[PDB]
């Protein structure tokens, strides 16, 4: 169901035309900064990688990166970019709510704008899928648009695109994107290291203007619940 919508967007058949507002033709500044800060290690997963710009940036710095996405069209595009640039990032189709076959593969996760599509129990299914796909003690980074950021993006997109509506007034449930919904998502199997104020770069299809809007940058520590860990502990105990 959701595969088709995004695939259509990447084919260029949506109101966005050639440029979906998240497909900025560069890595997200927050992830460039996170890399320079030294907080990316080991085998990296870019979950919901889209057309691969974040993953490709990391590939160019020597990281072993895998980009996963539900849209085969996005992955086709990312693979073409990898070929043209001569970088060896792994791009494959996968449902981030499932991730069967990727068990305990990753040491770090990055997420630019996948988590913020999930709400309620779907965000927890994503958290769990990430937990299954991560090595014990892995770190997941999640860049999520805030209500403040979405209100700005919505107004700017609404002015630019006929099909998109202007945002509502007033502050005040399921459509909300506070720090709390993200905290609630990554509960079982995770520990919140930090939630920070950050930015998310987007592009306006009309002018190709780039804007940065407010976003939350979460950092979550995957626990050490693993049979491999249990076995180490048994070896030392016995």
């Amino acid at each position: 169901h959701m595969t088709e919508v995004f695939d259509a967007v990447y084919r260029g058949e949506s109101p966005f035309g050639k440029r979906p507002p998240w497909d900025i033709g560069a890595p997200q500044p927050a992830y460039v900064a996170l890399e320079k800060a030294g907080l990316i290690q080991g085998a990296v997963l870019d979950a919901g990688c889209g057309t691969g710009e974040d993953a490709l940036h990391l590939a160019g710095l020597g990281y072993a990166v895998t980009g996963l996405d539900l849209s085969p069209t996005a992955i086709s595009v990312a693979r073409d970019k990898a070929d043209a640039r001569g970088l060896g990032a792994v791009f494959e189709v996968a449902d981030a709510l499932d991730l069967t076959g990727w068990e305990e593969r990753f040491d770090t996760v990055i997420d630019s704008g996948l988590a913020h599509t999930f709400e309620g129990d779907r965000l927890r299914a994503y958290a769990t899928a990430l937990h299954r796909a991560c090595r014990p003690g892995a770190v997941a980074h999640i860049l999520s648009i805030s209500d403040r950021g979405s209100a700005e993006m919505q107004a700017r997109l609404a002015e630019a695109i006929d099909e998109i509506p202007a945002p509502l007034p007033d502050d005040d449930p399921t459509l909300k994107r506070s720090a709390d919904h993200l905290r609630d998502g990554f509960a079982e199997g995770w520990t919140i290291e930090s939630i920070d104020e950050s930015l998310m770069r987007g592009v306006i299809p009309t002018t190709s203007e780039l804007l940065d809007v407010h976003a939350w940058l979460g950092r979550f520590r995957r626990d050490w619940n693993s049979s491999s860990v249990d076995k180490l502990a048994a070896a030392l105990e016995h």
């Binding site: 919508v5 995004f6 949506s14 979906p20 704008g113 599509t117 648009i145 919505q154 509506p165």
Partner: peptide, 8 residues
């Protein structure tokens, strides 16, 4: 909008 529904 972009991208909560997801994402037009």
């Amino acid at each position: 909008x972009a991208x909560v529904x997801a994402x037009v």
